[PDB]
Amino acid sequence: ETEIIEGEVVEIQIDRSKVGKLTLKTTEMETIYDLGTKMIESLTKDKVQAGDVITIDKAT
Amino acid sequence: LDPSIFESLQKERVEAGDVIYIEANSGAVKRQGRCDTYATEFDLEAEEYVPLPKGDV
């Protein structure tokens, strides 16, 4: 079994350790998440942009 | 713990609040994830959280 995120990204924010935030959407719901450090490294590495559709292996 | 075991904990990237298995004979050390009491530290973070063990210490 796996915990998986999948959705369209609607907003992504970063600061000058670092703390950022993003919002995701499906056809049926929305959420905002606060990001820990290791996700900030992953999201900044892969140049995610608003309107992208993405899937995340939560555990990894 | 002896400093050899401490080196092994450090190599596994263990910190306080992690859930750990030590085998005292082998000197084997295994990280099993963060304890779920801290699962709300952030909304998204890359760790995997496990419940506090129900077995004997």
Next chain:
Amino acid sequence: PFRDARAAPDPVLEAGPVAHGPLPVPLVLDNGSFQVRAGWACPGQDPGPEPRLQFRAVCARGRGGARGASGPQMLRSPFDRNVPVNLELQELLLDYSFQHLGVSSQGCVDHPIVLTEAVCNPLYSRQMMSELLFECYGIPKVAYGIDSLFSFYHNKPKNSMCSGLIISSGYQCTHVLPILEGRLDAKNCKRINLGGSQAAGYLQRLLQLKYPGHLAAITLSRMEEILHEHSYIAEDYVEELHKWRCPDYYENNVHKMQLPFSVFNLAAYHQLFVGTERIRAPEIIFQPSLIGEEQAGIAETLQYILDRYPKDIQEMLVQNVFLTGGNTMYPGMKARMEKELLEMRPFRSSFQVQLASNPVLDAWYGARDWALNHLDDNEVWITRKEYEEKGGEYLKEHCASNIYVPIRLPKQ
């Protein structure tokens, strides 16, 4: 379906029920924040026969201005967070209590009294409570003690020296009291700024937001019923609420609270379905973060005081964990407390959790049994003349009482 509460009983007595032996039978007065409990010591009878005057500690005086009323019947009450801080609204609460119990006649109450007070009581507050007592009512001698510690004194296996933690939870506070060799270790005692008042307030505001169509139908006296009769405390909250998540369990366990009637009438005369709400109201004392409030809660606090001792005396004082007062009445409380305690002890070690024989009345019965024993121990009491040389900020250090410190208050 909801009930309504009773009011206006018939307590009337003769001028003094004086028994054989010593004539100055003391009044035993539990000066509670939710309700007052008061009566004659009635010595020489093993079961306390009549703790009379079970009544809510609230008074009426409205837009009429010219009169006020005091018994069970806009409203006011004399406390701020379990310390009394009102003048005449305390007097007319005492007056009610004395008059319904009977009194001699002359310009004083002829009988000595034992009176409950806050776990710590501010010096100014103690001074005022002494002044408002010796000046107006002229009592010969007075004793102050703590509700919880009287309830412990009542529930002890023996009339002997002991150690324990007391867990106490009344209207507007819960306290954790470590006691050693009969003495409250008040240097490292702690309290939590929440209690059963705040639970009812939260459960009200929830159901108001759940059914805006009839704000007026739901009110404190009806919140009392669901919180007393129909609510329980989880063994583990995030697991209980998880088994409440599936509809087939929900429908079998949700509570159907029928309002009184004048579409099947529920669009206004609803059945007020309470599910998860019947857990979220009790849980406030273990997780104050269900409200806004950032405090440790009854779980982290107990560990945080228990790790401030040598490892031997921990294993001593945990041998008597005692539950008393108000909120401990919830079903499942012992089980939740002993499970939460099992995680924060050495792996093979032992502990014991005792629940008070009657969690709400044992504070009064304790004060009874205490005063009925210590009648003539004149080092224990404050005599009427002592208050004329010590200004009222003064206390006598008996067991089941707050720790005294040498201090004085300027007044003119």
Next chain:
Amino acid sequence: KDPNFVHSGHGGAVAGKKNRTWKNLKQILASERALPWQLNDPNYFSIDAPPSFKPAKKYSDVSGLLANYTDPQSKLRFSTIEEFSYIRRLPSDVVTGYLALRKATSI
């Protein structure tokens, strides 16, 4: 008959515009912090339990079940899709009403 009638003037607002019966508890405590206390002494203003160390769990507003999610506009938090459908149909009044239970930004 009655215990007494010539009751003393303890401190009520007969002599001036000041607060009616007596000072509130906060004002009393402000006058107790002035005294010559010492480091071992019990008190009423140093018995408060400490703040919690652990981060807080996140339960949903409208049902109390665990909430993975929070809505970016209303700022309420919810567990499932039907709950997200439900919240979007609420008026502003009950929305700010729920947030006020948690002393969130809502004032």
